[PDB]
Amino acid sequence: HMQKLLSLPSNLVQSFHELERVNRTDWFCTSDPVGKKLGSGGGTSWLLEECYNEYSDGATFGEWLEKEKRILLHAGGQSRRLPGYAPSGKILTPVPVFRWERGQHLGQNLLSLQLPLYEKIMSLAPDKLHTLIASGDVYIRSEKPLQSIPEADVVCYGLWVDPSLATHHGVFASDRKHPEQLDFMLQKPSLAELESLSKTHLFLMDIGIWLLSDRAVEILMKRSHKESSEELKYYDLYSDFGLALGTHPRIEDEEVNTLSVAILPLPGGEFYHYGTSKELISSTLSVQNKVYDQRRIMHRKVKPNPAMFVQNAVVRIPLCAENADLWIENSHIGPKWKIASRHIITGVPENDWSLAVPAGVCVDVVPMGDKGFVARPYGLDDVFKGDLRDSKTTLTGIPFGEWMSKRGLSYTDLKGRTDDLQAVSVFPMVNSVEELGLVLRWMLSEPELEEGKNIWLRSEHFSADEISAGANLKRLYAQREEFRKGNWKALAVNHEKSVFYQLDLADAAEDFVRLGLDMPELLPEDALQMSRIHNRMLRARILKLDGKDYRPEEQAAFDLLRDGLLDGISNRKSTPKLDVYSDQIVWGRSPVRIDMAGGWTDTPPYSLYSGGNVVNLAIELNGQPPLQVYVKPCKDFHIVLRSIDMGAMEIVSTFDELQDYKKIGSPFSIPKAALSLAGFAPAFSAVSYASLEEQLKDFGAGIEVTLLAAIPAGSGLGTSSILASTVLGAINDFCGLAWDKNEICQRTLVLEQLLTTGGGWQDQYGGVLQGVKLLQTEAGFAQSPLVRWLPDHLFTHPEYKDCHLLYYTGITRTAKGILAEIVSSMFLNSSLHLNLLSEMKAHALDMNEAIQRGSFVEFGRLVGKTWEQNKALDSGTNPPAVEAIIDLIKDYTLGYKLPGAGGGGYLYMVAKDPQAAVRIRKILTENAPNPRARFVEMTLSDKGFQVSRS
Amino acid sequence: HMQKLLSLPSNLVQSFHELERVNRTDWFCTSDPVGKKLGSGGGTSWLLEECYNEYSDGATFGEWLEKEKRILLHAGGQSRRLPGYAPSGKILTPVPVFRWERGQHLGQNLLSLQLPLYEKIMSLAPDKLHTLIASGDVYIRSEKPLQSIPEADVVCYGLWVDPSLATHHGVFASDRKHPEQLDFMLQKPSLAELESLSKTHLFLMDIGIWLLSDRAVEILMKRSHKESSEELKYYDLYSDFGLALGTHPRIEDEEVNTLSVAILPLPGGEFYHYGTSKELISSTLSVQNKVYDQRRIMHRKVKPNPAMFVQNAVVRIPLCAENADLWIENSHIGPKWKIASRHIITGVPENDWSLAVPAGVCVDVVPMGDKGFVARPYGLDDVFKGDLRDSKTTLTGIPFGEWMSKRGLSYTDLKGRTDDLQAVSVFPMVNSVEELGLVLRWMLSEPELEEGKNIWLRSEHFSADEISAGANLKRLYAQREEFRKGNWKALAVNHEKSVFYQLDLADAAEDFVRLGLDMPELLPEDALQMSRIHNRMLRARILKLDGKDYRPEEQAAFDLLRDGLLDGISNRKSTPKLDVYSDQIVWGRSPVRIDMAGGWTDTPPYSLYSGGNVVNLAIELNGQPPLQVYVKPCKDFHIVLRSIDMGAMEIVSTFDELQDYKKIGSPFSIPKAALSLAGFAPAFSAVSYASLEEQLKDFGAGIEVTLLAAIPAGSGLGTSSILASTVLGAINDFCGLAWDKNEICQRTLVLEQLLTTGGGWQDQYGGVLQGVKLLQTEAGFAQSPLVRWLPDHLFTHPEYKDCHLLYYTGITRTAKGILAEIVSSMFLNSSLHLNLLSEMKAHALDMNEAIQRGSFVEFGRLVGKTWEQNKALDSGTNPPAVEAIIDLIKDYTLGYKLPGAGGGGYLYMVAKDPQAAVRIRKILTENAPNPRARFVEMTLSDKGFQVSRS
Ligand SMILES: Nc1nc2c(ncn2[C@@H]2O[C@H](COP(=O)(O)OP(=O)(O)OP(=O)(O)O)[C@@H](O)[C@H]2O)c(=O)[nH]1
Ligand SMILES: Nc1nc2c(ncn2[C@@H]2O[C@H](COP(=O)(O)OP(=O)(O)OP(=O)(O)O)[C@@H](O)[C@H]2O)c(=O)[nH]1
Ligand SMILES: Nc1nc2c(ncn2[C@@H]2O[C@H](COP(=O)(O)OP(=O)(O)OP(=O)(O)O)[C@@H](O)[C@H]2O)c(=O)[nH]1
Ligand SMILES: Nc1nc2c(ncn2[C@@H]2O[C@H](COP(=O)(O)OP(=O)(O)O)[C@@H](O)[C@H]2O)c(=O)[nH]1
């Protein structure tokens, strides 16, 4: 597991692992020494020092830093501009579920949303960069493939967004002749400053993702201490260390300038700050406004305003269009509340207050002590900095002097600090919800309230620093959890309009079992089919986690899926007519396929969620099409089915026998379903016939179908789907149905839905259509792949053709059918699975690009990456014997993978060059893992499915 | 030229063609009959009836409606909420140049900005839709490719919008299970209705872009008249006709429901209101802040506030950050003015007034009569509706009763109507700028000024309706033109910070010549290179339009372009070494190319503006590579050059002779430049030599280069560039320079820059690289195409191969005039040319898609569309002889085009089928247009440039 190190507030360090439910093995956290601020760089150095002192197994710091890669997040500031989550350190702020996203956790926060990108970047990083540094108050997205990470001492990711937004952050400025290096950094530059440099420089806004080598770490830790030894000091990573980097740095440092700096634009990058109260709402609104298409929005709720976000809360007042810019979290809004706009309500316990909240002021309630509450009303624009007597120092939008004067208070009532509003003990700690409401009314729009002033005088006073230092986070998290327990039922009941069935339902089931909640009730038959499948699978998972019987629920979900996929599978009528002469035989034949990338993304229901991308190609094996079908007229008015590979024969005389797909011991389900779809079953026939015998008498003869699958099913080469398509095409030619290859593949999809195989669509398109292809579908039950052919240069040119090797290993899967687990995880919107499948889609697009550009090396590498993705999706795909075979020859390949679901069988290898291919052949021949392993010659098929007549 | 029909205010109809300088053939305008409103549908029927009565020519209404597609715009309301441009009908409102856009006209208005999208949609529409309907008070953008337009009776464009905004417009509601249909429309639905329909329906905001068939037009016009007679009536297209459409319409209508409705979401659509005074500022601010890319923003100037827009105006006071929401147009702001924020100043003549404008109040001055001015002060929030005695009836932010009382006035001074503020004659018409200023001061923040009241009492009074009805728009446009004449000089001087050199400089040159302005002075050498080229070409165009000598200015612009393209002349040095045996000969050969789509988009400087997209392929002619080069060692230490096609020979003995590219009568400039780039000229040689003879003595021998261009020059098949690349590749093999094909093409670009050809990069990549390719570059001087190969199925498969016909027309022509005209238009940011080139890029992408999908019919159709685009870009591309050749066989083709710049030469035809190809051959053989015309057999080249040794 990637190690996370966090610089947290002192109060949170002791409770982080319990409140966030994370183990101490993968998570280490500490704080700045109480009473001493260290800044960004100083806090990072202190975090590194603490983690080293914790796991110092006797090695020095230098050899310890190399031992593993680490992701360090600094969230140990004061959070002046975000008081609502200052005691949580910003990084633990709950983030609403995106109305366009599937598979998110209901209790997601900024940390859990932002961590995967950091882990991906670190796994892509070179091995000499053992330290990633980031701020936890941002949400960063990358919707395009990451570029190579250079081997510099400092690697900073940047993003050009808007000069107005760049005005508030760090900016990397690079000379127009050299965007590769960093010329200098700028901390919050003005619009005029960026304009004056626009003619000669490019600017990338600093998004707070830095990567440091051991040399840069040494220099930062030397700068974070004093002149002698261990004496710590304040040091800013971005304003002191940052401005000293680049070609022409603003700050001078002999050791910092020697560090090479590399600025990387984040591909498809998006940046959303979460450091101020205004940004808390604006960034969430932007993320919501990334998608507007209602066909891609699973949250079917009409909000009065898009900038209204309610999490872990109970709202007893009606919300209207005038209540814009609203953020309610971990709060209870009583029915007698009166609100306007621009509000941030956090931590408020249950109440029936008659509280009027003016526009622009926010209310925060922090649990303090065992039973007390600290009331912090503040302003959406309050910065909490500066001297109290300055007119610019504001509280709840009002200057602090005016706030004091209007309430009949004097500065003699504030004993303590007076030069910094952050350190002014002005927030009262009450011991009752009634006193809390009274003092909040007094501190807001009722300064004449007698009892409020009395309570404020009786109560102890806390500053924002003291609040963050003494907050009882256990009670805060417990209130949030009780609110979320109520919200689970609320969302499940309101499923037709809520985000319930687009959430990660595995996480939801875990939370249901942990909180002691009952399973959601069964959705009525009138509900959405997808929602019904989600509901049944969630109930099954809850029963499994509880220790009850879940098999019927699971099977019911699968049955709802198969019923859902039926489109024109009932009313698609054909009129088969004997289109050949009496002594003619129809021969159809098809090659198999190898999927290069994007496999699994065509599998329902994920393909229904977002559409699939698959790059694959048709291949003949040992110079022959492995799937073959013969169709001929029969003197008797019945259907004869013969199987060469199974060595069997069967006579179908009635409609009932033709549609008996699950007949015990029959290997003829595929041709039976194919003949049914061709119009020899009543449901698919345009003409009504009394019996199969009468239909065949009107037809002119019976039908004799002989089938050959020269490659057994489960080999991963697409045997079953391609055989179904071959039978369909032979019957198409024999019966004059005039189907084209695309319609044959679609009828194959329908056929496999008749047989309840539950697979995707990639195999039949890969085999029936010639050449190498990219296949893409959109979201929805209607899955009809758009086909884009690719150049076959990398597979047919003499310098490449002999580098594609196919090796039958003689090994079959030792593990069980994990496919069921994968499909059920898809039904539960499992976040890990959905993320991996999305990465597989993007990787299929990258494979398509590599093939288009004619890059053989990149093609082989991406094949290897597809193998890695498949191993990550299924642990049983790579048994140890296959891994030993791989290790025998891995040094001579650009990449390799198993075709299809894998688990053994065939190994596809892309040799580096023809000599490497000869070497691979020699090695695997002289070191056969078993007597059955053998090479199989594969050639790209320029024909696909072929059919001819005698 | 698609015909535009406009329903305008009555006063504007009489002067529209003169004020906007448009011909009466392509522009028709009328108004609703004065005294009766007809609504959207009634106004549409009246506009159609008027245009028919004008251009009937003896046809019936149906056969006239069929003749052509028409774009109808309704801009004929009262414009209560936009008084500053009410007499202009909103649609003629000047709109500031987008700071991120290139090629816009300085005098652009809303009409000129909105027309291109409508014309694009209409040209994409099926031929049965002859009528597009739109409102003139909106600005709509589409930044993603438009989808196919189905063939329905009514086609409506929509946009996914927040429900809160959808509450204020028409809404198309489609069942979630059938988004292809329209279920029903809703006119301004409430939030509760959207809640009730959100669970079962999708809603798209109506953006006001409808397309109607002739039957729908007939029904709309029957509904727009009464029942018995021809008397027109009010009829709403969206509330009456719209609510009667769909599957389950809200309103019942026997004839309207039979119309098929198709709802299309606008890809990448953006909607900007232009109906109220505040929206005038807000939508403009949004459009300005729409683009973020530093590479695409040429106007890099930060004003004190982003919401300050100044057009056609002189401002004598300084503008600061507090002057937000400011719109100054066609106005002179004297130095003694005092303004705040939220202002709209229009039509103010030159003055020295001491006028104080309070925040939120706007000033408008409308020329009236021969020399008079009507002063209309109003409020930014004034709606101009309601009875005068209501407190809500507002004027300049003040209730009208209070405004009357504060100036000692009574309702006995207002003769006329009193129930509608729009019809109250309260605005005085004065006869002098002095009286104008006095009465404006009186009507604003100086109600106690007696002289203002006296002038108001003596002067005639106009209502807003009377202003819009009697306004002297000629004087308004003349004042605007004088202001713009001043602004031209102001912008040209301030070129480093203005939008000057990103404007349409052809329009700018025309305006400079018309207004009698001198050309801008020469930019210093320290200015931006692109800006300097723009400056020189603009001076050249102004001199040419004036009748002076412009050739040196043009040549200087071309030289600045060539110098800008000079890149690696220093950091790409070669060391040629004799790499062949003494008796060995190197033979290089290349096929020609046919560009399928995107030609011209690779030509600088447009390729530098936005990058090029070109789909092209290599072809052999009559089974041979038409470009051939032989290189062999020479006993003498000189260079021998022989030309087979020119039948010539030349001896190069010195560096001076080798670099004499423009030698009189020499056809050897290409091989001389190629040998120079290979390292036989000192500037490109890594080793310094005293003379060419010494370099060749160290080399081991001289060089003998024989060239053959088997296809005559000017054929359009890429002969020159591909021959240059062939020489470069032959010399590369002969000298062991180890260049790859990409480097060969880049050296070809450098060679053509040495020879000052001024072309693009498409030809060399099309010829050197095998197969069919999409080539793409980004913006910037560095033009290095990314190459993506396409499947060659549509060109090599037997059912397609014989449909590609190449016919030498027997016409030759130096296509350098077409090149010069188009390149000079590119230098001037000619709006027509830039728009057409953008469409050519998009069309290249569509061609790439069609080839990927294997669609032969779509491929041929897109070839035809490429021919149409080329004809539209240059009128000289299709001479009448080529057009006559085309007309002989056009009925047997899916498409056709001339390769390259055209002007004659070869005709590429995509026959519908092999029989059609036989027919085309027969027709063109039996009817040869000239003794030289002949068919040439073309075959796709799977080799590209090849080189071998004897
Ligand atoms: N360990 C530690 N980290 C800090 C300290 N100050 C700031 N940081 C971190 O450095 C990053 C950048 O600083 P800021 O965004 O200004 O931190 P902040 O909490 O917003 O500070 P203020 O709002 O000014 O109170 C933040 O993510 C903080 O987590 C500090 O004193 N100690
Ligand atoms: N943590 C978290 N809680 C949420 C989120 N969305 C909603 N909630 C909580 O769940 C409760 C129920 O949500 P819904 O079923 O959508 O109800 P609502 O739309 O918020 O309001 P009503 O239906 O009118 O009661 C809300 O009151 C919120 O407190 C979310 O994205 N994240
Ligand atoms: N031909 C015609 N066009 C109209 C009519 N009414 C409105 N329009 C046009 O349709 C467009 C949309 O209507 P509105 O924006 O509400 O028209 P308007 O002139 O702004 O009306 P007010 O601002 O309320 O005075 C406007 O640009 C008008 O020019 C009409 O009765 N006949
Ligand atoms: N029509 C039109 N006029 C403009 C535009 N931008 C500027 N102008 C006018 O041109 C004059 C020159 O403006 P500019 O060179 O940018 O100077 P600046 O605006 O003071 O910085 C201004 O006084 C404006 O009145 C525009 O986009 N359209």
JSON list of N, CA, C and O in Angstrom, two decimals, chain B residues 835-860:
[
{"chain": "B", "resi": 835, "resn": "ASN", "atom": "N", "xyz": [-13.04, 31.74, -41.77]},
{"chain": "B", "resi": 835, "resn": "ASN", "atom": "CA", "xyz": [-14.19, 30.88, -41.49]},
{"chain": "B", "resi": 835, "resn": "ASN", "atom": "C", "xyz": [-14.21, 29.66, -42.40]},
{"chain": "B", "resi": 835, "resn": "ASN", "atom": "O", "xyz": [-14.44, 28.53, -41.95]},
{"chain": "B", "resi": 836, "resn": "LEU", "atom": "N", "xyz": [-13.95, 29.87, -43.70]},
{"chain": "B", "resi": 836, "resn": "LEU", "atom": "CA", "xyz": [-13.95, 28.75, -44.63]},
{"chain": "B", "resi": 836, "resn": "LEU", "atom": "C", "xyz": [-12.82, 27.78, -44.32]},
{"chain": "B", "resi": 836, "resn": "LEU", "atom": "O", "xyz": [-13.00, 26.56, -44.44]},
{"chain": "B", "resi": 837, "resn": "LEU", "atom": "N", "xyz": [-11.65, 28.28, -43.90]},
{"chain": "B", "resi": 837, "resn": "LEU", "atom": "CA", "xyz": [-10.55, 27.39, -43.56]},
{"chain": "B", "resi": 837, "resn": "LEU", "atom": "C", "xyz": [-10.85, 26.60, -42.29]},
{"chain": "B", "resi": 837, "resn": "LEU", "atom": "O", "xyz": [-10.46, 25.42, -42.18]},
{"chain": "B", "resi": 838, "resn": "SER", "atom": "N", "xyz": [-11.53, 27.21, -41.32]},
{"chain": "B", "resi": 838, "resn": "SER", "atom": "CA", "xyz": [-11.97, 26.46, -40.15]},
{"chain": "B", "resi": 838, "resn": "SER", "atom": "C", "xyz": [-12.93, 25.35, -40.55]},
{"chain": "B", "resi": 838, "resn": "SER", "atom": "O", "xyz": [-12.81, 24.21, -40.07]},
{"chain": "B", "resi": 839, "resn": "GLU", "atom": "N", "xyz": [-13.87, 25.66, -41.44]},
{"chain": "B", "resi": 839, "resn": "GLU", "atom": "CA", "xyz": [-14.77, 24.63, -41.95]},
{"chain": "B", "resi": 839, "resn": "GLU", "atom": "C", "xyz": [-14.01, 23.55, -42.71]},
{"chain": "B", "resi": 839, "resn": "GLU", "atom": "O", "xyz": [-14.39, 22.38, -42.67]},
{"chain": "B", "resi": 840, "resn": "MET", "atom": "N", "xyz": [-12.91, 23.91, -43.38]},
{"chain": "B", "resi": 840, "resn": "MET", "atom": "CA", "xyz": [-12.12, 22.93, -44.10]},
{"chain": "B", "resi": 840, "resn": "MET", "atom": "C", "xyz": [-11.39, 21.99, -43.14]},
{"chain": "B", "resi": 840, "resn": "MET", "atom": "O", "xyz": [-11.28, 20.79, -43.40]},
{"chain": "B", "resi": 841, "resn": "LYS", "atom": "N", "xyz": [-10.88, 22.53, -42.03]},
{"chain": "B", "resi": 841, "resn": "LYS", "atom": "CA", "xyz": [-10.32, 21.68, -40.98]},
{"chain": "B", "resi": 841, "resn": "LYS", "atom": "C", "xyz": [-11.35, 20.68, -40.47]},
{"chain": "B", "resi": 841, "resn": "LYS", "atom": "O", "xyz": [-11.09, 19.47, -40.38]},
{"chain": "B", "resi": 842, "resn": "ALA", "atom": "N", "xyz": [-12.53, 21.18, -40.09]},
{"chain": "B", "resi": 842, "resn": "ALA", "atom": "CA", "xyz": [-13.58, 20.30, -39.59]},
{"chain": "B", "resi": 842, "resn": "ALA", "atom": "C", "xyz": [-13.96, 19.25, -40.64]},
{"chain": "B", "resi": 842, "resn": "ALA", "atom": "O", "xyz": [-14.22, 18.09, -40.31]},
{"chain": "B", "resi": 843, "resn": "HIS", "atom": "N", "xyz": [-13.98, 19.65, -41.91]},
{"chain": "B", "resi": 843, "resn": "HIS", "atom": "CA", "xyz": [-14.32, 18.72, -42.98]},
{"chain": "B", "resi": 843, "resn": "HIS", "atom": "C", "xyz": [-13.24, 17.66, -43.15]},
{"chain": "B", "resi": 843, "resn": "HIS", "atom": "O", "xyz": [-13.55, 16.51, -43.47]},
{"chain": "B", "resi": 844, "resn": "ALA", "atom": "N", "xyz": [-11.98, 18.03, -42.95]},
{"chain": "B", "resi": 844, "resn": "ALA", "atom": "CA", "xyz": [-10.92, 17.03, -42.96]},
{"chain": "B", "resi": 844, "resn": "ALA", "atom": "C", "xyz": [-11.13, 16.00, -41.86]},
{"chain": "B", "resi": 844, "resn": "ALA", "atom": "O", "xyz": [-10.94, 14.80, -42.08]},
{"chain": "B", "resi": 845, "resn": "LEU", "atom": "N", "xyz": [-11.56, 16.45, -40.68]},
{"chain": "B", "resi": 845, "resn": "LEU", "atom": "CA", "xyz": [-11.86, 15.50, -39.61]},
{"chain": "B", "resi": 845, "resn": "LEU", "atom": "C", "xyz": [-13.03, 14.59, -39.99]},
{"chain": "B", "resi": 845, "resn": "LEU", "atom": "O", "xyz": [-13.01, 13.38, -39.71]},
{"chain": "B", "resi": 846, "resn": "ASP", "atom": "N", "xyz": [-14.06, 15.16, -40.63]},
{"chain": "B", "resi": 846, "resn": "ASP", "atom": "CA", "xyz": [-15.19, 14.34, -41.07]},
{"chain": "B", "resi": 846, "resn": "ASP", "atom": "C", "xyz": [-14.77, 13.31, -42.12]},
{"chain": "B", "resi": 846, "resn": "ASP", "atom": "O", "xyz": [-15.25, 12.17, -42.12]},
{"chain": "B", "resi": 847, "resn": "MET", "atom": "N", "xyz": [-13.89, 13.72, -43.04]},
{"chain": "B", "resi": 847, "resn": "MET", "atom": "CA", "xyz": [-13.36, 12.79, -44.04]},
{"chain": "B", "resi": 847, "resn": "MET", "atom": "C", "xyz": [-12.59, 11.66, -43.37]},
{"chain": "B", "resi": 847, "resn": "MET", "atom": "O", "xyz": [-12.73, 10.49, -43.75]},
{"chain": "B", "resi": 848, "resn": "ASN", "atom": "N", "xyz": [-11.76, 12.00, -42.38]},
{"chain": "B", "resi": 848, "resn": "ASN", "atom": "CA", "xyz": [-11.05, 10.98, -41.61]},
{"chain": "B", "resi": 848, "resn": "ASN", "atom": "C", "xyz": [-12.04, 10.00, -40.99]},
{"chain": "B", "resi": 848, "resn": "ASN", "atom": "O", "xyz": [-11.83, 8.78, -41.05]},
{"chain": "B", "resi": 849, "resn": "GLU", "atom": "N", "xyz": [-13.12, 10.52, -40.40]},
{"chain": "B", "resi": 849, "resn": "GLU", "atom": "CA", "xyz": [-14.13, 9.65, -39.80]},
{"chain": "B", "resi": 849, "resn": "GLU", "atom": "C", "xyz": [-14.74, 8.72, -40.84]},
{"chain": "B", "resi": 849, "resn": "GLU", "atom": "O", "xyz": [-14.85, 7.51, -40.62]},
{"chain": "B", "resi": 850, "resn": "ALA", "atom": "N", "xyz": [-15.12, 9.27, -42.00]},
{"chain": "B", "resi": 850, "resn": "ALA", "atom": "CA", "xyz": [-15.73, 8.46, -43.04]},
{"chain": "B", "resi": 850, "resn": "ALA", "atom": "C", "xyz": [-14.80, 7.34, -43.50]},
{"chain": "B", "resi": 850, "resn": "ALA", "atom": "O", "xyz": [-15.24, 6.21, -43.72]},
{"chain": "B", "resi": 851, "resn": "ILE", "atom": "N", "xyz": [-13.51, 7.65, -43.66]},
{"chain": "B", "resi": 851, "resn": "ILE", "atom": "CA", "xyz": [-12.57, 6.61, -44.08]},
{"chain": "B", "resi": 851, "resn": "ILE", "atom": "C", "xyz": [-12.42, 5.55, -43.00]},
{"chain": "B", "resi": 851, "resn": "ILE", "atom": "O", "xyz": [-12.36, 4.35, -43.29]},
{"chain": "B", "resi": 852, "resn": "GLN", "atom": "N", "xyz": [-12.38, 5.97, -41.73]},
{"chain": "B", "resi": 852, "resn": "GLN", "atom": "CA", "xyz": [-12.28, 5.00, -40.63]},
{"chain": "B", "resi": 852, "resn": "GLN", "atom": "C", "xyz": [-13.48, 4.06, -40.62]},
{"chain": "B", "resi": 852, "resn": "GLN", "atom": "O", "xyz": [-13.33, 2.86, -40.39]},
{"chain": "B", "resi": 853, "resn": "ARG", "atom": "N", "xyz": [-14.67, 4.59, -40.88]},
{"chain": "B", "resi": 853, "resn": "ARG", "atom": "CA", "xyz": [-15.90, 3.80, -40.81]},
{"chain": "B", "resi": 853, "resn": "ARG", "atom": "C", "xyz": [-16.09, 2.90, -42.02]},
{"chain": "B", "resi": 853, "resn": "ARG", "atom": "O", "xyz": [-16.98, 2.05, -42.00]},
{"chain": "B", "resi": 854, "resn": "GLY", "atom": "N", "xyz": [-15.29, 3.06, -43.07]},
{"chain": "B", "resi": 854, "resn": "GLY", "atom": "CA", "xyz": [-15.44, 2.26, -44.27]},
{"chain": "B", "resi": 854, "resn": "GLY", "atom": "C", "xyz": [-16.65, 2.59, -45.10]},
{"chain": "B", "resi": 854, "resn": "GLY", "atom": "O", "xyz": [-17.15, 1.73, -45.83]},
{"chain": "B", "resi": 855, "resn": "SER", "atom": "N", "xyz": [-17.14, 3.83, -45.02]},
{"chain": "B", "resi": 855, "resn": "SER", "atom": "CA", "xyz": [-18.33, 4.25, -45.76]},
{"chain": "B", "resi": 855, "resn": "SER", "atom": "C", "xyz": [-17.90, 4.86, -47.09]},
{"chain": "B", "resi": 855, "resn": "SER", "atom": "O", "xyz": [-17.40, 5.99, -47.13]},
{"chain": "B", "resi": 856, "resn": "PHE", "atom": "N", "xyz": [-18.13, 4.13, -48.18]},
{"chain": "B", "resi": 856, "resn": "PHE", "atom": "CA", "xyz": [-17.71, 4.59, -49.50]},
{"chain": "B", "resi": 856, "resn": "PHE", "atom": "C", "xyz": [-18.57, 5.75, -49.98]},
{"chain": "B", "resi": 856, "resn": "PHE", "atom": "O", "xyz": [-18.05, 6.73, -50.53]},
{"chain": "B", "resi": 857, "resn": "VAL", "atom": "N", "xyz": [-19.89, 5.66, -49.79]},
{"chain": "B", "resi": 857, "resn": "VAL", "atom": "CA", "xyz": [-20.79, 6.71, -50.27]},
{"chain": "B", "resi": 857, "resn": "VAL", "atom": "C", "xyz": [-20.49, 8.02, -49.56]},
{"chain": "B", "resi": 857, "resn": "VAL", "atom": "O", "xyz": [-20.39, 9.08, -50.19]},
{"chain": "B", "resi": 858, "resn": "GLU", "atom": "N", "xyz": [-20.34, 7.97, -48.24]},
{"chain": "B", "resi": 858, "resn": "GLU", "atom": "CA", "xyz": [-20.03, 9.17, -47.48]},
{"chain": "B", "resi": 858, "resn": "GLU", "atom": "C", "xyz": [-18.66, 9.72, -47.88]},
{"chain": "B", "resi": 858, "resn": "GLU", "atom": "O", "xyz": [-18.46, 10.94, -47.94]},
{"chain": "B", "resi": 859, "resn": "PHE", "atom": "N", "xyz": [-17.71, 8.83, -48.17]},
{"chain": "B", "resi": 859, "resn": "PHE", "atom": "CA", "xyz": [-16.39, 9.27, -48.63]},
{"chain": "B", "resi": 859, "resn": "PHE", "atom": "C", "xyz": [-16.50, 10.07, -49.92]},
{"chain": "B", "resi": 859, "resn": "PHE", "atom": "O", "xyz": [-15.94, 11.17, -50.03]},
{"chain": "B", "resi": 860, "resn": "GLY", "atom": "N", "xyz": [-17.21, 9.54, -50.91]},
{"chain": "B", "resi": 860, "resn": "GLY", "atom": "CA", "xyz": [-17.38, 10.27, -52.16]},
{"chain": "B", "resi": 860, "resn": "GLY", "atom": "C", "xyz": [-18.10, 11.59, -51.98]},
{"chain": "B", "resi": 860, "resn": "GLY", "atom": "O", "xyz": [-17.73, 12.61, -52.57]}
]
